[PDB]
Design an enzyme around this catalytic site. Structure first.
Site, PDB file in Angstrom:
ATOM      1  N   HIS A 174       0.591  -1.310  -0.138  1.00 45.56           N
ATOM      2  CA  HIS A 174      -0.048   0.128  -0.493  1.00 45.56           C
ATOM      3  C   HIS A 174       1.170   1.510   0.012  1.00 45.56           C
ATOM      4  O   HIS A 174       0.766   1.937  -0.737  1.00 45.56           O
ATOM      5  CB  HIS A 174      -0.829  -0.078   0.991  1.00 45.56           C
ATOM      6  CG  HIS A 174      -1.766  -0.614   1.189  1.00 45.56           C
ATOM      7  ND1 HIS A 174      -2.339  -2.079   2.242  1.00 45.56           N
ATOM      8  CD2 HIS A 174      -2.697  -1.658   0.035  1.00 45.56           C
ATOM      9  CE1 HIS A 174      -2.989  -2.615   1.982  1.00 45.56           C
ATOM     10  NE2 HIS A 174      -3.460  -2.695   0.806  1.00 45.56           N
ATOM     11  N   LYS A 216     -15.598  -7.351   6.894  1.00 44.94           N
ATOM     12  CA  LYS A 216     -15.194  -8.183   6.250  1.00 44.94           C
ATOM     13  C   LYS A 216     -14.359  -8.265   7.636  1.00 44.94           C
ATOM     14  O   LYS A 216     -13.617  -8.997   7.690  1.00 44.94           O
ATOM     15  CB  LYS A 216     -14.495  -7.300   5.925  1.00 44.94           C
ATOM     16  CG  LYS A 216     -14.322  -7.055   4.360  1.00 44.94           C
ATOM     17  CD  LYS A 216     -13.048  -6.597   2.569  1.00 44.94           C
ATOM     18  CE  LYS A 216     -13.669  -6.937   1.325  1.00 44.94           C
ATOM     19  NZ  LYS A 216     -12.366  -5.766   1.409  1.00 44.94           N
ATOM     20  N   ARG A 270      -2.690  -6.247  -8.179  1.00 42.09           N
ATOM     21  CA  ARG A 270      -1.850  -7.311  -7.848  1.00 42.09           C
ATOM     22  C   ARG A 270      -2.029  -9.072  -8.877  1.00 42.09           C
ATOM     23  O   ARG A 270      -0.917  -9.255  -9.342  1.00 42.09           O
ATOM     24  CB  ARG A 270      -2.035  -7.836  -6.322  1.00 42.09           C
ATOM     25  CG  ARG A 270      -0.869  -8.240  -6.360  1.00 42.09           C
ATOM     26  CD  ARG A 270      -1.369  -8.650  -3.998  1.00 42.09           C
ATOM     27  NE  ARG A 270      -2.685  -9.360  -3.779  1.00 42.09           N
ATOM     28  CZ  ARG A 270      -3.078  -8.225  -2.606  1.00 42.09           C
ATOM     29  NH1 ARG A 270      -2.310  -7.674  -2.518  1.00 42.09           N
ATOM     30  NH2 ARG A 270      -4.199  -9.283  -3.058  1.00 42.09           N
ATOM     31  N   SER A 285      -2.532  -7.734   2.816  1.00 47.02           N
ATOM     32  CA  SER A 285      -2.890  -7.867   4.162  1.00 47.02           C
ATOM     33  C   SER A 285      -3.237  -9.036   4.847  1.00 47.02           C
ATOM     34  O   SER A 285      -2.749  -9.466   6.112  1.00 47.02           O
ATOM     35  CB  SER A 285      -4.089  -6.697   4.441  1.00 47.02           C
ATOM     36  OG  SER A 285      -3.667  -5.371   4.410  1.00 47.02           O
TER      37      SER A 285
END
Ligand SMILES: COc1ccc2[nH]c(C)cc2c1
Ligand SMILES: COc1ccc2[nH]c(C)cc2c1
Ligand SMILES: COc1ccc2[nH]c(C)cc2c1
Ligand SMILES: COc1ccc2[nH]c(C)cc2c1
Ligand SMILES: COc1ccc2[nH]c(C)cc2c1
Ligand SMILES: COc1ccc2[nH]c(C)cc2c1
EC number: 2.7.7.3
Lengths: 158, 158, 157, 157, 158, 157
Positions: B17, B41, B90, B128
C-alpha cells in the site's frame, strides 16, 4: 419438448439473470428457473422471497417456471426431466468453478448437458453480491434490477 | 489541483500500500488515502486503529490525507472532490473484481476515473490477509510492514 | 503539476476503444502524446498518423506523433512521466504487467497507469476489427467515421 | 422448436475433442451444421471435409459443409440460431467471450452456446496434436481412426 | 535422503490428494503429509480425525509419514528437515494464491523449494470443498474418496 | 534415489531466469540435463549450447545437451524421470498444464515438476529480452555476462 434448467441462488435475481433466462427461453421449449436454498451462503432473502421475486420478474416469459429446491442439483434436474443445464458465464473465476460443477454434474447425471451463455455487455460486470454491496451503502441500483426486486431490496435494507 | 483517492480496507496498511500511495503522490497534487470501515470483512483493526496506523505510516508524504469512511465509495469520492480513484493491481482475481467495481463506480460517478498502478516486484505477492496469516503463526513479517504497523500487529496478536 | 503522458501503440487503425482511452487520459493529464509506432501493419505510418490526428482533433491537449525507438526511449526523450495503457481483459492484464515491470526497469521515472475502456469497447481490438472487416463483417460501430472510410477503401483494393 | 445449430472451425484435422462437442450438440438440437472454414492448414479443405464426414457419419443430424464467408454471414444464410463453441480452458474462455460479443453485434439472432468437452479431451487441440505428431509423438488416442491414417500418410511425405 | 513435505488442510483427504502424494513418493525418499489444523477454515473434521483418515488412506505407501501441525508452515518444514514443499496445482485461482504462499515461504525459509505437481485428469476438477458440497446434498462421492474417507464422510453427515 | 531430471527449452538465449530455475533443480535432483531444442532462433544451436555451458559451468551436476526429437522421446532415451518447467505467470500455467497432460500421455513415467523463479525474473522471457535489446533497450540485468556480450555482438551486425 426440450426442457432446460437455470439454477442459482438468485439472491436476488438481477437483470443479468433476466437476460440469461430470456435467451434460454428463445432456445428451449421450457425453462425451469431453479432457486437453490443455499443456507451455506446465508442469503439475504429467504427462498420463499427469492421465488416470489423471480416469479414476478419473469411473469412476462410464458415458458419460464420458477421453482425452489434444496435437493442435489443433478437429482432435481433429473426429477424435472431436464436434459440441459443453463449457466451464465461472467468472469474467469466463475468459469473455473463452473467447469468443476459441470464435471461433477456430468458424473452424477451424464445425460444432463451443461451449456453456458454469455450475458449482454450491459450486465457482464454485475452480480447479486455487488448489487447488494452498493445498496448496503445506499447507492442507486435501479438500473441493475427488475422493478419489483429493487423495491424489495430497498425495503429489506430499510 | 488534481485530487485522487486511494480507497481500501487497509487492515493493516502494508508496504505494498505504501508503494502505491507513494507513486500516486508523484502523479497527483493531493492524494486521499481513504479507509473503508468494511464491517462485512470483520477487520482485525478498528477503523480508528487503521486510520492512525496509516497516518503514522504516511506522515513523510506531504500531500497524503488519511480519512476513514463508511459512505458509498462514489459518494465519498464526489464529496472529496476527487476525479481519480487509485487502485493497486496484484493478481488476476483482483483484476476481475476491480473491473466490476470500476464499472459500477463509473455508473455511479461517471467523472471519477479509475486508474490502476502496478506495485513493485518486491510487494507483488503480499496482501494484508497473507501478512496477518503469517503473523498469526508467529512468522516474521517485519519486511512487509511499516515499523509502526509491525509493532501494532505484534501487540494485537499478543 | 503539469504532467506529460504518453499513450503508445500501433493504432492500425485507431478504434473507438483507443479514442475512449485517450479521451479519459486528456481529462486526467495536461498533455497527452498519442504515440504511433513505425513498425506488418495494414495502414502505413503516415496513414495511421493522419487517421489518428483527424479522430482526435477535437481534443485540445492531444499531440499525435510517430516514433521508431524503443517506447521507453521515446518516452524519456519526450519528458513523459506517465505511460497510458488500456486494460480490456485478463489476457491484456497478464502481458501488460510483464511490460510494465520491463518499462520500470528501463525508465524508473515513467509510471505506468492502466485505464479501463467503456463496456462498449472492452471486447474489440484493431486486429479483430481488421479481421472482421476483411471477411466482410460490419465494423462501422467500432471506428471513427474517417477510419471507417479509409478501411473500406483499403479493403476494396 | 426445430433449432438449427452451427459448429464452426478449421478442423485441421478433426479430433476426438471435436467429435465429443458435435455429439453433445446433436443430443441438444435438431440439426447441427459442422462448418469447416476454407482458410495455412495442414489438410486441404476437401481433405478436412471428407475426414469430418466419415468421422461423423454415425450422427444422423450432422451436416458437414465448407464455408469461406465470415462465420456469422454463413450462419445467417444457413438460418442457424445457435452457435456451438467448445470451451477447454481459461485461455479459450477469454478469447471466445470477445468473439461472442462481436458475433452478437454482427448477428444478434445467433446465440452463442458453450459446451464443455470430456476431461479426456480438455487439454488437446488440432495444433498440439499436429505438433506432437510432426515431432514423432503418438497421437492415436486423440483422433478418429480415419484421421489417424490420413495424418500418418501426410507426415510420411 | 531427500525429504519432502506435502502440506494442506485435507478436510478430508481426496483421491486428488492421494494422486499427488503418490507421485511425490515416486520422486523423493521420504514424504511428510502434513495436515494443518486450519481453525480459520472451520474444518468439518477435527485435526485428529483428518490425520487418522490420511494415515489409513496412505498406509499402502511405505515412505509417507502423516503428521498434524499448527506451526508456521516454514518452521514446520525446517523442523522436519524438509527441503522440498509439494503442492498440487488445480486451477488459476489456486495457482496465483500458491505463488503468494511460495514467495512468502521462500522469504521465511529460502532453502525450502516449492514444487508443483499436476493431478491426473481424473481429479483435476475436484476439491475437498466440492466433494463436501455434493455429500451435503446426499450425492454419490464414492468415486472421489478413499474407502475409509467415504465411510467417515457419510457417518459425519448422518 | 538417484534422480535424473531434464530441463528443456529453446534457450535463445539463456537468461538469468533460466539460470535461476536450473540452479534450483540442481539443489533438488542428482543430475540435471539442460536440454536445448534444435529448432527461427536468434542464436544457432551451437551458439545456444556454448552460451548455456559457460553460464552453468559452476554447477557440477548440470549437463548441457542439444536435442531435435520430441522432448518426451529425448527424455525417455536419457532415462529422465523428472521434467523441470519454470512457471512465471497465469499464461504459462494454462499452457504448461496442457503440455503436461500431453507429456504424461506420451511418457507416463516422466513426472512434470513446476518450479517458481525469483521475483526478480518472474516477468522476463528470452523473447521479451530479445525484443527490448533489438529496439535499443538495456537488458544487462537479465542475462549472464557471456550472453550479454554475445547478444550485443549479434545485434551489432
Ligand atoms: C440445492 O442447493 C445446492 C447447492 C450446491 C450444489 N452443488 C451441487 C453439485 C449440487 C448443489 C445443490
Ligand atoms: C465504505 O465501504 C464500502 C465498501 C464496499 C463498497 N463498494 C462500493 C461500490 C462502495 C463501497 C464502500
Ligand atoms: C507497455 O509498454 C509498451 C512497450 C512497447 C510498445 N510498443 C507499442 C507500439 C506500444 C508499447 C507499449
Ligand atoms: C466464435 O465465432 C467464430 C468466428 C469465426 C470463426 N471461424 C472459424 C473457422 C470458427 C469461428 C468461430
Ligand atoms: C498450520 O497452519 C497454517 C496455515 C496457513 C499458513 N500460512 C503460512 C504462510 C503458514 C501457515 C500455517
Ligand atoms: C512442457 O514440455 C515440453 C514439450 C516440448 C518442448 N520443447 C521445448 C524446446 C521445451 C519443451 C517442453
Amino acid at each position: 419438448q426440450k426442457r432446460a434448467i437455470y439454477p442459482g441462488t438468485f439472491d436476488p435475481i438481477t437483470n443479468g439473470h433476466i437476460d440469461i433466462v430470456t435467451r434460454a427461453t428463445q432456445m428451449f421449449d421450457h425453462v425451469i428457473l431453479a432457486i437453490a436454498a443455499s443456507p451455506s451462503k446465508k442469503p439475504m432473502f429467504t427462498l420463499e422471497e427469492r421465488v416470489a421475486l423471480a416469479q414476478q420478474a419473469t411473469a412476462h416469459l410464458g415458458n419460464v417456471e420458477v421453482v425452489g429446491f434444496s435437493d442435489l442439483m443433478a437429482n432435481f434436474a433429473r426429477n424435472q426431466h431436464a436434459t440441459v443445464l443453463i449457466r451464465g458465464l461472467r468472469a474467469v473465476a466463475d468459469f473455473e468453478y463452473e467447469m468443476q460443477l459441470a464435471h461433477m454434474n456430468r458424473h452424477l447425471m451424464p445425460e444432463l448437458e451443461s451449456v453456458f451463455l454469455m450475458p449482454s455487455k450491459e450486465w457482464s460486470f454485475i452480480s447479486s453480491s455487488l448489487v447488494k454491496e452498493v445498496a448496503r451503502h445506499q447507492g442507486d441500483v435501479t438500473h441493475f434490477l427488475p422493478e419489483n426486486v429493487h423495491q424489495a431490496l430497498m425495503a429489506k435494507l430499510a
